[PDB]
Point group: D2
Chain length 123, copies 4
């Protein structure tokens, strides 16, 4: 999964996830969203299980993007939680949480939830 | 500019300990120790926060990840917390979280727990 | 088991009012009044609960739905609460919820909010 | 508006069967049969939908609940699906769901699974 996870991935929206998996469990890279209040690349950091089970299970992982870069600041952050599944049609299947910074009176509606599936090939 | 407000030791309602450093570049680095679950001692965390939040009283958006592997245990799972920091006398980090376990394909429909943790600067 | 415990008026941390009847057959019926959002007055709710919960001290699983349309407003959205009832001197219903808004396909990635509400038998100030 | 479009038999990606009647008043009634999990045969479901959806091409919001007790099994849990119906040649109901199991207080942090199901009018 070190070599399997490292590289360029694309989700069903056409967003681009560029990641390097380190031997120590680290995830580092950039994310470019095809939708939303976003332009160009944003820093991402995360972690993955660097010694997954040998029983055919996937490899658990997660990462975060704060939606601030040199071009825009959406005052929000998304975390993706999911698992990498290797093989001919490799995939990273995730669920995600997008929290906006809000006032206290708006906090009940601060967080979106969704799900993204990443594949090595762009749909 | 919540670098100083976020950096430090935080505790959630379960008694877990979140130790974080906020970097000027938006980085979150540190350790997490869960009071519950398949866990022992500290685990590495990394994440990101909005280093230039709005100045209208809104909170500061942030998130981080722990993969539950350390030198003592490997639960083959990862949790991400997504939330916002609220400064002030009773500073808080209010989060929702997703915990995904590595599964076979047949078990993937039940791979992911959801919950919510509130962190404060004083422990329960 | 908890028909009488669940039936009644409950309030969450936002000051919303959840009025429910638990039927012997597992049904939940009632009305919801949200203190926040694109809502006024009462909306119909329906749901289900475990009418024969475990006897080991576990809570009682339940859930319900509100579609945010009534005679006054239509927010073109629906919220589902999923949770458990915990009986005792300080009874509580602890939930997580999903609010989905009807969207076009291009907006569907941002259709769904998630949150958490705790309901008690006495309301906040 | 979508009473006739929603009413009927639907199937998700797991092969589960969702049988629903949409009432003129916004009610949803029917049965659910899960292809996976601690489940056998049909369970009662009830829910609600927007009976006067927007006319700008948006989907129709809806949700429903199953408590996983029937004459055969009791899993002491309930699932709520929250989502929208999208009409047309390939009609679909896209949902996210929350499955809460009754737990003791010490296990409540891990009480709730989250997932997503897509329903179509023809089985995979």
């Amino acid at each position: 999964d070190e070599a399997g996870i490292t590289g360029t991935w694309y989700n069903q929206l056409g967003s681009t996830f560029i990641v390097t998996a380190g031997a120590d469990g680290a995830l580092t890279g950039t994310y470019e969203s095809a939708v939303g209040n976003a332009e160009s690349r944003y820093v991402l950091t995360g972690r993955y299980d660097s010694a997954p089970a040998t029983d055919g299970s996937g490899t658990a992982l997660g990462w975060t993007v704060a939606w601030k870069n040199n071009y825009r600041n959406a005052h929000s952050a998304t975390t993706w939680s999911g698992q990498y599944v290797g093989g001919a049609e490799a995939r990273i299947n995730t669920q995600w949480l997008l929290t906006e910074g809000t006032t206290e009176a708006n906090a009940w509606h601060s967080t979106l939830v969704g799900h993204d599936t990443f594949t090595k090939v762009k749909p």
